[PDB]
Amino acid sequence: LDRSEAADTWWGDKDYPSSVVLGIGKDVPSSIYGVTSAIAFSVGAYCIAQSNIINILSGSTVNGFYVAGALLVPYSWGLHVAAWIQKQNGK
Amino acid sequence: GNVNNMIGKYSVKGTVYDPLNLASTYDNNWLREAELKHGRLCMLAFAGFIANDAGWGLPGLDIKCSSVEAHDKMVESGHMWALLAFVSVCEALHFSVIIPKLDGDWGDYEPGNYGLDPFKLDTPARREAELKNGRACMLAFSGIVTQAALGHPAPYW
Amino acid sequence: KSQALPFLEAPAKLDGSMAGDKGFDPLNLAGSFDINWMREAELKHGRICMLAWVGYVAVDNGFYVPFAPHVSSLAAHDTAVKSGQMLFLLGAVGVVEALSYNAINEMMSGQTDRRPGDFSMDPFKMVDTPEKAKSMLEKEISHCRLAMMAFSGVVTQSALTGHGFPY
Amino acid sequence: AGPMYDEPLAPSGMGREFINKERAPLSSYVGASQELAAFPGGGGKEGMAPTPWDPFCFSELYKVSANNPDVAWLRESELKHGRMAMLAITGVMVQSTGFHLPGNAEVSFANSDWVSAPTTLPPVVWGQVLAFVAIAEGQTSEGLFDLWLGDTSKREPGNLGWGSGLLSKDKKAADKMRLKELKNGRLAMLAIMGVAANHFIPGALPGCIY
């Protein structure tokens, strides 16, 4: 990737960042971002709790579909940050 | 408001009864509203004490108890919870209407004028009678409860 | 106005330009993300489901290759995995799928005028002109959607109860 | 070039003029208390003293740096702590009498130990309470970084919009109600922290009953 092939994303003067920083998610509405963030956080917390807390994680038997979904907690964080960004962008 | 312009002075002598000069301490309209509410609640309480001790009953309560101990029995049963819900709704409306005008302009809301006059029975003489009956009921119900609580039967003496 | 949901209007991106455009997008997913990727994914799912449906139906109505295990299509996956032919087909489709990585990149970047779901397979010039292309693309996407739903029903019935071509 | 003795380290054209502008004073906030100015000679009326109380001058610490919060933020935090402490002291007082919700096989709300009362509940029951508090404190908080640097514009300190219409239209009575709020909140804060201190070390609050 060359230095020229890069959009101007700097937003220090502005109060909020442009939607270009979201990449492919620039056009995603804020309501969809927020509701998906809530669903993702709930599902990931449920998966981690059922993997480690409710059942103590045994090496012989780990579900895998609970290991997946545990990654949605960072995804939920990103989704709610993007929800805020889209809310301030009015998009 | 000003207590000197209100209804409810001494009837036959015409002087205001504020020996302790507490009218100037608080908003006079609030004093009128609280006086009317206390009087009305005490008329209801007086009549209810007498009716319960008489044994009128209510459509649907089987519990028969003296008014001195009816509080505990009825709160255990659950009727007092429904009564509290009703009173809470009505007094939350009164909250919303009066508390925004505690120490400020009361607007067109006269103290105690809820507008429950469907039969068109309003009269200044009847307002005076309301205040006097409320005061008499406050004192009478005070006496009736502290006499019944000491174990005196229904006539209260 | 959206035809599928006549109580509201269709999004800005559903404009007829694409085949099978009934103005159906209650969630604005194609407004949220590029619609060419959506159409290519829809087409790919539909072709896989069409071929899966007809293959399931034939394997259940006896159609096997020489040197093959005579097994119902439900356990055909496991038996073919054990035989090893499954991995050969995995490589065969993986070649086309990596070429599809390249094709999708070119399509989205605009380096080529590639239509979604297009690999330039027209031996018989079945769509060499615009109106033929529109008609045949509408008919395909209809077949794609119908076969997708049909195969979902089939495989599930098969995994739930019974067997055979009917279920 | 502003109220602060030093220019903010935030740069020009990226916040400096936003931080270094004029800010409202402590005297323009409804917090004065007649009780502190309750002695012969100098004194106040209507429950308010002529001047506010600030022996340590935390209100005007912004002039040293913009690291320190503004009086808008401090009033927001004061009202938040007061409201939370009022609910907390009312809750402990009501719970210690033994009154509790009905309950069932799954949940048992019967516990008079306010310190260990949440521990008795199932994970879901207190989970809902904490989740509601987490969502609300976080949704109602918009423009709080603006109250820190001082821009009481978008957000008034303590005005979440919940029941703000019941405030009287007269300025005097509105300020009276706000002062009643602040006084009750501060009293409840002292009460709840005193009960907690009494629990942790006995004898901290001699008038305790819990």
Next chain:
Amino acid sequence: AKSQALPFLEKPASLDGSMPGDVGFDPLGLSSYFPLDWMREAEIKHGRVCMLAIVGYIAVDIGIRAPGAEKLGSLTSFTAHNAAVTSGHMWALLGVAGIAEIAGMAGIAATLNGSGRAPGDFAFDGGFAKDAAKLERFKLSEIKHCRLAMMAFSGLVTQDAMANGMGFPYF
């Protein structure tokens, strides 16, 4: 000026007679807090759910059984929920409800964004949008029935719960 239902109380700001069935009844002022279109959509949804629920409850208490539903057993309306969720047909009901609710989300989002769709207008009318005045009268009747039906189902299900397994009257 003043609320029609509560003349002693000042009228809510948001309520202005635009919506059908408006009487200015809002002591708590939640309309001023959260949007009124969302509130009316929720009101109509609750009313539709409750007023179908009343009919279903009374029908299956009387003894009307769906085709093949008799296999579930000697089920009254009181105990049908648990048996249905165990048998799994209630999961199919959840699926159909979600299918309808996708269009529900689309409609509410449209009317909040500014599509102009009325709250509760799902374009599913049975040819009764010929006249706007007729539609307005029907909407007022709908909202009145919704308000009645929420309370009716509340009383119905409690009375049934208090009486345990009980039939149609509850008297």
